[PDB]
Specification:
The complex is a heteropentamer, with two copies of chain A, one copy of chain B (42 residues) and two copies of chain C (324 residues).
Chain A (H helix, E strand, L loop, with lengths): L5 H10 L3 E2 L19 H26 L13 H8 L7 E3 L5 H6 L4 H9 L22 H15 L6 E6 L6 H12 L4 E7 L2 E2 L2 E2 H4 L9 H4 L3 E5 L3 H16 L5 E6 L16 H10 L6 H23 L6 H6 L7 H13 L3
Parallel strand pairs in A: 1-7, 2-3, 3-4, 4-8, 7-8
Antiparallel strand pairs in A: 5-6
Helix pairs in contact in A: 2-3, 2-11, 2-12, 3-10, 5-12, 6-7
Chain B lengths: L5 H9 L18 H9 L1
Chain C lengths: L1 E2 L1 H15 L3 E5 L15 H5 L4 E3 L4 H13 L3 E4 L11 H7 L3 H4 L9 E6 L14 H4 L6 E3 L4 H13 L4 E6 L8 E2 L13 E4 L4 E5 L3 H13 L5 E5 L8 H11 L2 E8 L5 H12 L8 E5 L10 H4 L3 H12 L2
Parallel strand pairs in C: 2-3, 2-4, 5-7, 6-7, 10-11, 10-12, 12-13
Antiparallel strand pairs in C: 1-8, 9-11
Helix pairs in contact in C: 1-7, 3-4, 8-12, 9-10
Classes of the chains: A alpha/beta (351), B mainly alpha (42), C alpha/beta (324).
The complex binds ligand TPW (2 copies), potassium ion (K) (2 copies) and magnesium ion (MG) (3 copies).
PDB class: oxidoreductase/transferase
Keywords: Oxidoreductase, pyruvate, dehydrogenase, dihydrolipoyl, acetyl transferase, multienzyme complex, transferase, Glycolysis, Phosphoprotein, Thiamine pyrophosphate, Acyltransferase, oxidoreductase-transferase complex
Assembly: pentameric
């Protein structure tokens, strides 16, 4: 009987997606040529933001326990994946986050207190400031992908030299909307950057249960677009990968899929990885360059705590929602039924 | 016991005519709004 | 000009494409091909591939595209080849676009008009003619529109496209070319959420939408031969319902029946009934009865004529009401 | 044995898994984790990974997996983590399984039970608590069950699971473990399509389901203190409706109201009203009014309190009908 | 700035999906290594079936024109992609066909007259005989894929040494259920054969507007499963690919995605008339002295004739009544149907 080279195909294709890295666990450069071009001040800001995001997760988990915060998905451990990738964007770029990507939209311009309002479940939390190109975190896993393709086609259509960046997890790569989103962008050669943050888990489900594909970035192959696997714990690798994808995109060459290998330090909503932490390797990196110091890190840490405390206060001073408010933001021109109901509640709200 | 449309019953009630006291000359013995006007008249 | 309903739909799109540079038509086979029913015929030729284009075969992506495009300032007018396929894109419609304004508290909105054919009486294969308006009528944030004439299709579609929130535009297959009617050239609008009296009457109110309006007009003419004057009200917008028009008629007639092609457990007939019962129960001389299809899966093509409600069913139900 | 609805749930599943080897339970995180709400806790440990397993994150695929497995003689009891995610699998349920027996003239069938939690009052994030029973109540080929007590839950689920046609079992989040009740050990059943009178009354009939049942009972208690005796009917199956029990209570009270958690334009309150209007209009002293949520997208967490209907709203509406 | 080897990436993956071909247009064996082990009689039955199908298509179009048939999607040109693949299956395999795949389920056991009732829109046309493992043609593009993953897992669990085979077109690959189907089948290592018949068009949309992927077979990479691109016009290559996939599958190794490259003869000057599967295979068999014009014409007359009695059995089938439609909705009819059933039972009498 005849036999096809099925095992070779699986290996050969996967081989096309080796893990791209620049900084290893000890903060040692290992990919000199890939080294992105960033100034000392830029590298310091990148560290500042990652340290700041860590404290935000630490505080958020805390406030969520005190009941001062509602829904919240931890982000500790994904700083490089979330922050470094955002550091590659321009203000003109449009971001479509997932329920766990509040940090990205925060650094893109969304006030911290509205991010907290988002957690509490209040409409003002999603009234993104005009000019800040983001959408509220998407709860339906996969929807942000097909929507991203649209945003991108939209930017291309208006000739803007910007991109649309969206995120999802490892489990999200099993969704139909995940596939349709990258296939459309590719089919329309739209400026989109699709990121997949692989933390090896989907709530209690290990990524092995999601698919048998050796890698996640190879899924881009189904859309015929480029894919890249990067060390999700590496700031420089992520910055560079996203930067290359943005570059490719603004020059009209299409979208790109990027898979980041990382790990969140739990929970949903091990001391081994403790050394693979992004803050650790980046700290060593900057210190050997005389670019970082405890004084600086303690400054940012306190700075984060102060602003977090103030933001949680503003969220508290936001007027409680009323049904009339909810009815009014349903349409531009309220339909008959809502006009009727608006009076019913306006009355009920009188006393 | 039954049978009458709401228009009848709420007409009966207004006029204070206990609907159970009016016979009814409609299909299957339905109390018509004319059977109540004839209960008050006579 | 004497137009068919599909001709008026096209004219309206053409008008909107010329009137607003942001309008975009896209979907499966709508571009070069001009649409499976010729609804987008010539639109690409006149406005270009940037304004009227084809997409990959996937309804969900089409919906996601429209949402994205709307976030970038466009006025998306996407198409779903047959509404039986709405299942593939329920999230983008009911879970996303219909909620954007609300979700973003006004910061973002969705000037999206989704067009989709549906309807029985033309021996189409499975899931091509199902009446699913009942599903979308239940989602806050959407407006569902179902025209029955060339005149109405053109006016509402222009209104539908200009509206700044999501609107589902259901085009009945049997009504595409069934007949012609005089339609004003140039642009004009018909308000959404507004019905109209296709026939004035005094003995019974017959509420209907879609191909059922014609069937109701047919029953009305047969009824008039027996001295039963029926008033036929065309909803023209199934969500929101035009309460004043509907109730105003029942209060005058005292009797009413709601007619739909959809199955008894579907469509929007039950909503109409509860609203009448709620606002004019005191004017009723008989229960508000319904004319609808059996509660089974849409019929295999050869069974259509014995399953689908027609004028004969309406007359009978109207008589049941008269003789109550 | 004092059980919470969730425990009663788990027990019904345990019983079926043991009494029928064809029963399979799968979905997102329902195995080793025991489900996000412990509904399937310890089930995989007792029956194996071959019977209670996890699946990739794709609701559509889950639906197809259920359909396929059924074609191979299995009795699939898949889970959709939150009913708000039903949009991804709308075709498998309404466009597929609900139609298999009919589509194949009985050659094949779908003994599938889809479990899914919903309901407000627990501050869940977006699209978790949406009441969408209204969408599936409209698809011929399905039966939708919504229990409000541990006792009802277990008996209906065993029935649900045993039924040989697709059944949708919706589980309210706020009723999962908000109270305990005496639930009989061993397997028993409650017929589907059968209502349940939780409180005998003579003045007005209050129909409700889900969390709204307990709110109707709490309101009945207050209404009594005021001289109004309310007969509270718990539908327990929103499709098909138990017409017999409904009209019987109505023919006796002469007055009624339907109470749901869904938006007025959604749910199934409108259908109940319609059924009453055509079967017992000659007994109604006043119109049947509905207690439902405003027609806006499900409320942001913080606004659940002022938005979700409660006993106070049932009280107020019961009175309005009482003084019509 | 340095650059990622994106170009090299696309070129590399492409190289993993060359077109599998055994016979050329002239009917010459160009790849004797992968030559499928088929007996003379088997080879003839395959030619006969392909010819039979071309005739069924031609007669189906005519009968549709005369209104004696309803919905119909042409098959002319896809005989090798459809029949040869079916030829590699066993009675025990379950087929989840598309709207155009009526041929495949006919040869798997579905009587021709029912296939015609299916076209006309009659429930009896979907009452598949017991034992015959197929589903009525699927109209919702992609749905048959996720269902196929469920069917495959079922066979796996029952321990059966059978597979689940399903088909979709090029357009269908853009759908989500398409992806989810092959991913589920992959994540469960289920015995499923996924076939993608690429005729370069989805109604008026050419495959180029569907995706920018160079092959449709490479989409398999997203599921982590093997993909094969075959010459959909070569009966032997299609058979060899499917036979290979059935084997990998019943041996617990999982599913395979197969893309056949073919073309339709019109509805749903030019070229490809030389690529017609019946041409090369005919030349192939004639060179081996296994086919004569006489035999072919016997098959044709046998076809036209069986088609006539089939359209006659369809005509003689009793008209549908509402009571029937209701009776097949559930095992035990709900109240509303029990009620409606009486209403229509009375009308019907
Ligand atoms: C369409 C839909 N179905 C299920 C769910 C429920 C859910 C919310 S979060 C989650 C696991 C996601 O894991 P992933 O690896 O993708 O991302 P991450 O948490 O960063 O590791 C599920 C299943 C939602 N929200 N939407
Ligand atoms: C979910 C859905 N969306 C659209 C359609 C409508 C349709 C029926 S056939 C077709 C083109 C399919 O082209 P493909 O190349 O895949 O197959 P083929 O006919 O051999 O060329 C479409 C879009 C259906 N039925 N379902
Ligand atoms: K609109
Ligand atoms: K069941
Ligand atoms: Mg993850
Ligand atoms: Mg989906
Ligand atoms: Mg094709």
């Amino acid at each position: 009987t005849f036999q096809f080279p099925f095992a070779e195909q699986l290996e050969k294709v996967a081989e096309q997606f080796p893990t791209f890295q620049i900084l290893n666990e000890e903060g040692e450069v290992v990919n000199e040529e890939a080294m992105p071009e960033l100034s000392d001040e830029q590298l310091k800001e990148l560290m500042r933001r990652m340290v700041y995001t860590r404290i935000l997760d630490q505080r958020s988990i805390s406030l969520n326990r005190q009941g001062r915060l509602g829904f919240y998905a931890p982000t500790a451990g994904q700083e490089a994946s979330q922050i470094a990738s955002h550091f590659a964007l321009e203000k003109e770029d449009f971001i479509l986050p997932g329920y766990r990507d509040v940090p990205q939209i925060i650094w893109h311009g969304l006030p911290l207190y509205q991010a907290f309002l988002f957690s509490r479940g209040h409409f003002h939390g999603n009234q993104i400031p005009e000019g800040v190109n983001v959408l509220p975190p998407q709860i339906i896993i996969g929807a942000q992908y097909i929507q991203a393709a649209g945003v991108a086609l939209g930017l291309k259509m208006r000739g803007k030299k910007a991109v649309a960046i969206t995120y999802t997890g490892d489990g999200g790569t099993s969704q139909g909307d995940f596939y349709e989103g990258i296939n459309f962008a590719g089919a329309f050669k739209a400026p989109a950057i699709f990121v997949v943050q692989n933390n090896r888990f989907a709530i209690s489900t290990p990524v092995e249960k999601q698919t048998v594909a050796k890698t996640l970035a190879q899924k881009a192959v189904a859309a015929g677009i480029p894919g890249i696997q990067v060390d999700g714990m590496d700031p420089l690798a992520v910055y560079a990968a996203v930067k290359a994808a943005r570059e490719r995109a603004i020059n009209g060459e299409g979208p790109t899929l990027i898979e980041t290998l990382c790990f969140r330090y739990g929970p949903h909503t091990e001391n081994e990885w403790a050394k693979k932490d992004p803050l650790v390797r980046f700290r060593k990196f900057l210190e050997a360059k005389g670019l970082w110091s405890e004084e600086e890190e303690n400054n940012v840490i306190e700075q984060a705590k102060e602003e977090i405390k103030e933001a949680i206060k503003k969220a508290d001073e936001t007027p409680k929602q009323k049904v009339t408010d909810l009815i009014s933001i349903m349409f531009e021109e309220l339909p008959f039924n809502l006009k009727e109901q608006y009076e019913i509640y306006k009355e009920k709200e009188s006393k | 016991r039954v049978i009458a449309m709401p228009s009848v019953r709420k007409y009966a009630r207004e006029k204070g005519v206990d609907i159970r006291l009016v016979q009814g000359t409609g299909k299957n013995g339905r109390v018509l709004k004319e059977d109540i006007d004839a209960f008050l008249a006579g | 000009a004497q137009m068919t309903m599909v001709q008026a739909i096209t004219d309206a799109l053409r008008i909107e494409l010329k009137n607003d540079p942001n309008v975009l038509i896209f979907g499966e086979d709508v571009g070069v091909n001009g649409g499976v029913f010729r609804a987008t015929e010539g639109l690409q030729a006149e406005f270009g591939e940037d304004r009227v284009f084809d997409t990959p075969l996937a309804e969900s992506g089409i919906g996601g595209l429209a949402i994205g495009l709307a976030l970038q300032g466009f006025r998306p007018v996407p198409e779903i080849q047959f509404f039986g396929f709405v299942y593939e894109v329920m999230d983008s419609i009911c879970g996303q676009m219909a909620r954007i304004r609300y979700r973003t508290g006004g910061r973002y909105h969705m000037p999206i008009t989704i067009r989709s054919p549906f309807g029985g009486g033309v021996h189409t294969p499975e899931l091509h003619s199902d009446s699913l308006e009942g599903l979308v009528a239940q989602q806050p944030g959407l407006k569902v529109v179902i025209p029955s004439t060339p005149y109405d299709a053109k006016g509402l579609l222009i209104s539908a496209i200009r509206d700044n929130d999501p609107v589902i535009f259901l085009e009945h297959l049997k009504l595409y070319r069934s007949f012609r009617q005089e339609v004003p050239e140039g642009e004009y609008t018909i308000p959404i959420g507004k019905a109209d009296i296709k026939r004035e009457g005094k003995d019974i109110t017959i509420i209907a939408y879609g191909a059922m309006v014609h069937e109701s007009l047919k029953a009305a003419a047969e009824l008039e031969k027996e001295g039963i004057s029926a008033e036929v009200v065309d909803l023209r917008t199934v969500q929101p319902l035009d309460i004043e028009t509907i109730i105003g008629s029942v209060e005058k007639t005292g009797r009413a029946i709601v007619v739909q092609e959809a199955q008894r457990q579907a469509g929007i007939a039950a909503n109409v009934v509860a609203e009448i019962n709620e606002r004019a129960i005191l004017s009723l001389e008989a229960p508000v009865l319904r004319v609808a299809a059996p509660d089974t899966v849409y019929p295999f093509a050869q069974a259509e004529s014995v399953w689908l409600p027609n004028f004969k069913d309406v007359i009978e139900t109207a008589k049941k009401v008269m003789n109550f």
